[PDB]
Each structure stands twice: as C-alpha cells, then as structure tokens.
Design a protein around this nucleic acid. Structure first.
Ligand SMILES: [Mg+2]
Ligand SMILES: [Mg+2]
Ligand SMILES: [Mg+2]
Ligand SMILES: [Mg+2]
Ligand SMILES: [Mg+2]
Ligand SMILES: [Mg+2]
Ligand SMILES: [Mg+2]
Length: 71
RNA sequence: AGAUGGUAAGGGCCCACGGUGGAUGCCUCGGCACCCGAGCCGAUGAAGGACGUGGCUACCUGCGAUAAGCCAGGGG
C-alpha cells in the first residue's frame, strides 16, 4: 500500500478543487458501500475500510492546501 | 464381711496433620527530600470538560466527522 499511496499526493495534487470534491464524494459513497456490507457480514477485509477512511483524509488534506491562494 | 481397678456423654493438656487468616522476609511499575534545569497559556478560542472515534471495543490511552489518525522535513 505504501507505494500505491505515494501516488495520490501526485495523481490527486494535480487536479484542483472541483475535481477533488467530486472524487471525495465518490470515495465517501464507497465507504458507505463498505460499512453497509459488514453490518450484514459479507465484507470482512477490514483493511479495506480503514484503508478507504484514510484515503479520504488525504484527498481532503490535499484539497485544504490548494484552497489557500492558487488561482 | 474387705477391697482399689474400671465406663468417657463430654472436658483438659501434650503431639501430629490440615483449614482459616495474611503477620514476617525478600520484591518494587510508586511515593519523599534536596539539588540542578526550565517557567506561562488564551477570542489564531486557554485550563478543564461533553459527546463521539476501532471490521467486532466495557474501560484506559490516542485522536476529532480527515476522529488509535492526515501532509512534509528530520532521526531511525
Ligand atoms: Mg476403685
Ligand atoms: Mg464421643
Ligand atoms: Mg489466601
Ligand atoms: Mg482544550
Ligand atoms: Mg476516548
Ligand atoms: Mg460500529
Ligand atoms: Mg521519513
């Protein structure tokens, strides 16, 4: 995951506000999708959940830095 | 016609072995003292808190809806 993690910061850093907010919306739904399965059992690869929870944290963290001057 | 042994419901003392109870000894993640060092925080919202936060979490810790963590530099 470490590797596939050092990407976002880049593949996500170069997009802008309107590109992220929508990307994050997408992720947030996926997270719902998950926590929605466990409640019934299905999904069990926890690693997935926490893994997605932290992704959003990054997108937001990156979007927060962009909204401070730029253009 | 004489006689002092003897019964132990229980009791008493001595011994042996246990039960209880946690003194004693060694122990120490703790406290105490003195001496250095360092000495302020907040409406850029403090001190302290409430509630929440884990795939399953009662409590503690850590965190804050980015919630046991997010970005970057440094050490390893
Ligand atoms: Mg007699
Ligand atoms: Mg008897
Ligand atoms: Mg005992
Ligand atoms: Mg506070
Ligand atoms: Mg807590
Ligand atoms: Mg839950
Ligand atoms: Mg490093």
């Amino acid at each position: 995951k470490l590797s596939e993690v050092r990407k976002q910061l880049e593949e996500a850093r170069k997009l802008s506000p309107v590109e992220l907010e929508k990307l994050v919306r997408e992720k947030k739904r996926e997270l719902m999708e998950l926590r929605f399965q466990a409640s019934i059992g299905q999904l069990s690869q926890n690693h997935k959940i926490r893994d997605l929870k932290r992704q959003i944290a990054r997108l937001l963290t990156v979007l927060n830095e962009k909204r401070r001057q730029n253009a």
